[PDB]
Amino acid sequence: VVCREASHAGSWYTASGPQLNAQLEGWLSQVQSTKRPARAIIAPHAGYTYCGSCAAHAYKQVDPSITRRIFILGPSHHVPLSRCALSSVDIYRTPLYDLRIDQKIYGELWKTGMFERMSLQTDEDEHSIEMHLPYTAKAMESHKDEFTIIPVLVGALSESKEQEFGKLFSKYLADPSNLFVVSSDFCHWGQRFRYSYYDESQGEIYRSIEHLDKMGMSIIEQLDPVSFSNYLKKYHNTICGRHPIGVLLNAITELQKNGMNMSFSFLNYAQSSQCRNWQDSSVSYAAGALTVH
C-alpha cells in the first residue's frame, strides 16, 4: 500500500472535492492576511462544522509562494506512543488532490533512531494529522505541484523528549522554505471529559474556560516551554496537542539561542458551545501563527 486513504472524509469533513474546496475558500476569504509568511501555525483538528472557520485564521497566514515543505505534527488519540512516529506510505489522499511525503526529510528523520513507524492501520485510524490535509491542500492550491508534507505522529512525550525533538526539528524550523503545522484543540470542559475546573472570579463557566485557555495562549506567545509546562502542571488544561506544542516551543528556544528572533500571535479563539451549567460540555479552538523576523 502506497496511499493513506482519506479515512475521515465524509463525516469529519465533506468527501466531495469541489464542495470542500468551496467551503474552505469561503472561510479563507473572511480572514485578512496579517502574519505572512508563517513559519508555523497552531490550528484545531475538530470536525470542519465545528472549527472550520477558526482554522482559516491560521491557514490564511501561510504563504504558498515561499512554503515548500509542510511538517504536520499531531497528537495520537488511539495508540500508546512514547515517542514520535512516521508514516509507512508515500502519499496522503485528500478530496482536493493527493499530497506527497518528502522522502528526503523522511529518510533523515528515520535515520536519527528517534522514530517508530506507524502501521497503515494506526496511520488511517488517527485524525489529528488528516484534519490539516484539506486545509493545506487548499492553502497551497496555486503551487500545488511544488510541495511535500512531513506527517509526524507525536505521542505522550516526556519533557526530555519534547526538548530532544524540539532540538531535532529546530534545524528544519530555521529553513524559510519550511512550515510547521502543530495540531491541537484547547480546553475540553465537562463531566464527559473528567475536567471541570472553574474560576468563579471570571464569571460564567464559558468565561472561566476562555480565561484558562487564553492564559496558555499568552504563554505560548511568550515562547516559553518551561512556563507552558508549569501551566499544564498547575491547571491540567485538557489541550490535546500539548506534546506537539511543547516540541514547537523547544524548537523555538533552540533557534533563539542561535541568534534568531520570532514571534507568535493567536489570531482567533472559539468554543463549540457556551457552557453555563455543570451539565454542559464544550471544546475550545485557537488558531495562531509564528513569524520569523
Side-chain angles (χ1 to χ4, degrees):
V1 192
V2 307
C3 301
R4 186 203 179 271
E5 293 298 324
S7 51
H8 309 259
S11 35
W12 291 66
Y13 58 90
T14 313
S16 180
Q19 303 195 22
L20 176 55
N21 187 250
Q23 203 181 12
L24 298 168
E25 173 73 19
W27 286 323
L28 289 165
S29 75
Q30 295 186 111
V31 178
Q32 300 305 258
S33 58
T34 217
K35 302 298 175 176
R36 295 196 163 178
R39 192 70 62 87
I41 60 178
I42 291 171
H45 60 246
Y48 283 6
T49 301
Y50 304 109
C51 63
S53 45
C54 181
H57 290 261
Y59 285 93
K60 195 59 186 272
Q61 306 323 317
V62 182
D63 205 330
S65 78
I66 282 179
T67 292
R68 294 290 163 259
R69 258 133 19 202
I70 311 190
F71 293 69
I72 313 172
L73 307 212
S76 57
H77 282 92
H78 309 295
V79 287
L81 214 197
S82 74
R83 36 220 179 114
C84 287
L86 305 179
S87 184
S88 68
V89 306
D90 296 312
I91 293 175
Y92 271 29
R93 297 191 77 191
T94 92
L96 300 204
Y97 56 91
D98 300 340
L99 306 179
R100 309 181 276 117
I101 303 191
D102 190 290
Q103 302 290 321
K104 200 201 164 171
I105 297 183
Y106 246 45
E108 287 162 359
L109 290 179
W110 183 250
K111 287 160 171 65
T112 66
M114 294 167 73
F115 299 85
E116 282 165 42
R117 183 77 67 196
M118 305 186 251
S119 62
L120 184 58
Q121 188 228 63
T122 295
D123 211 329
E124 287 189 345
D125 195 28
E126 189 52 68
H127 67 279
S128 73
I129 289 163
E130 183 175 350
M131 291 318 112
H132 299 288
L133 301 174
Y135 248 114
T136 296
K138 179 58 174 170
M140 302 295 303
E141 211 167 28
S142 61
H143 286 84
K144 82 176 226 175
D145 301 321
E146 287 166 80
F147 79 96
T148 45
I149 62 173
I150 316 281
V152 176
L153 189 73
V154 181
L157 307 177
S158 65
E159 282 170 31
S160 279
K161 282 268 150 219
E162 288 185 354
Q163 299 166 153
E164 285 157 17
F165 282 99
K167 189 170 191 161
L168 181 79
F169 282 123
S170 212
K171 68 187 206 141
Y172 297 107
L173 190 62
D175 179 350
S177 302
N178 291 351
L179 166 74
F180 281 69
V181 180
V182 169
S183 192
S184 193
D185 296 345
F186 277 71
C187 190
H188 309 236
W189 198 91
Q191 184 185 13
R192 72 133 92 207
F193 302 114
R194 283 172 299 278
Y195 191 76
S196 63
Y197 179 67
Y198 175 45
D199 180 349
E200 297 187 4
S201 70
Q202 298 305 316
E204 285 178 8
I205 293 167
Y206 73 86
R207 288 301 197 208
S208 164
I209 297 163
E210 185 185 17
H211 184 78
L212 204 225
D213 278 324
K214 277 176 172 175
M215 279 193 40
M217 291 156 66
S218 14
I219 286 173
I220 294 162
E221 295 179 349
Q222 299 314 287
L223 306 181
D224 192 335
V226 174
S227 180
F228 186 61
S229 180
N230 292 161
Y231 157 82
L232 299 165
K233 302 171 181 186
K234 185 185 247 132
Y235 303 102
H236 307 101
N237 188 187
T238 38
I239 299 164
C240 81
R242 66 184 168 273
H243 300 291
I245 295 158
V247 170
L248 175 66
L249 261 7
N250 284 287
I252 294 160
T253 67
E254 193 64 28
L255 299 189
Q256 289 171 355
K257 300 182 192 177
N258 282 319
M260 286 179 57
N261 179 259
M262 64 214 100
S263 62
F264 194 99
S265 294
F266 282 100
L267 261 1
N268 191 63
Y269 179 71
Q271 307 175 146
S272 68
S273 46
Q274 292 186 328
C275 293
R276 286 174 224 247
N277 313 300
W278 295 107
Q279 311 293 291
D280 301 338
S281 57
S282 75
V283 181
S284 299
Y285 314 114
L290 175 75
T291 68
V292 176
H293 311 141

